[PDB]
């Protein structure tokens, strides 16, 4: 069983984190986003996963080598010259997706975090015998998305309404696709969109079916939705496997701590914090609604809220970091510095206060 992961560009919207490692390798909940998906794809019997990227994948060849051996799965890159959209890459890598068994293949948005009911979706797709199945999830602002209009008694999709000024529903594209090989005959090797060009073709032939996604969903493509997705994901661990969440008198809410991380005495971590491997959180540190990536040090008495601290960064003593601050890799914030939404490029030294760029 084959699978495709739609990456596209390196991800400007996640700068400066993506300036060091492209979008599918940025950490989410102590794991690179690629792991969350491949672990899920492997659990349904996927043996090869094609990565549809826009950048040169040589920058991530050393990481994927190790991930292929540990996860026992084939990862093949499929780079595009010009941006082919979300359906275009399906044609560019049609040779790597067709294996002759006529079996359907999975397609995933590289920035979608969920519980991935891929087993439950396999049985859904084979029941109605349609050409393509997509996952659907409900949101609060469907006017900002393309809303699905589906025959809810059967699941058959009639049409997609892009950015409806008037309410026609609240179910949107959840980014999880299950497509038969025949779909690849409806996509030319040009920039085409699967939701606005390919799906209407299948929606006309009455071969498009939608399955409501049971569980949380979030596209962490941008920083605001990244923090939101971390909260929804951590509460999923609270509901599913609470043993993975940490606990103690210094813990409020749901906190995920890597076993190789150091937590100093007298801290207060939470709610909704993810601390990565090799992190040194010194004594008396306040952390909430933030992500601390691999190898960053938070010196004593610092307070961090609603922020993302890039790999191997260093927050000085009594520093104040809040309001959607994003430190890149290897950023050294000095003591007592105040960041109100600072966006610091990698390897920089922050010696004075910074605000929103």
Author numbering: 1 to 357
The publication says:
In crystal, VTC1 dimerizes in a manner similar to that of GMPPB, with the dimerization interface being solely mediated by the C-terminal LβH domain. Two inter-dimer interfaces were found: the first interface is between catalytic domain and LβH domain, and the second interface results from side-by-side arrangement of two catalytic domains. The first interface could be of biological relevance while the inter-catalytic domain association may be merely due to crystal packing. For structural description, one VTC1 protomer (chain A) was analyzed by the dictionary of secondary structure of proteins (DSSP) algorithm which defined the secondary structural elements. The catalytic domain comprises of 14 helical elements and 13 β-strands (β1–β13), and the LβH domain consists of 17 β-strands (β14–β30). The central β-sheet of the catalytic domain is made up by nine strands in the order of β5-β4-β1-β6-β11-β8-β12-β9-β10. The LβH domain has 5 three-β-stranded coils and one two-β-stranded coil.
Plant vitamin C biosynthetic pathway contains conversion of D-mannose-1-phosphate (Man-1-P) to GDP-D-mannose (GDP-Man), a step catalyzed by the Man-1-P guanylyltransferase which is commonly named GDP-Man pyrophosphorylase (GMPase). Arabidopsis thaliana VTC1 is the first genetically characterized plant GMPase and has unique properties when compared with bacterial and animal homologs. Structures of two GMPases have been reported, which are the crystal structure of GMPase from the hyperthermophilic bacterium Thermotoga maritima (TmGMP) and the cryo-EM structure of human GMPase (GMPPA-GMPPB complex) that is arranged into a dodecamer. These structures show that an oligomer-forming monomer (protomer) of GMPase consists of two domains: an N-terminal Rossmann fold-like domain and a C-terminal left-handed β-helix (LβH) domain.
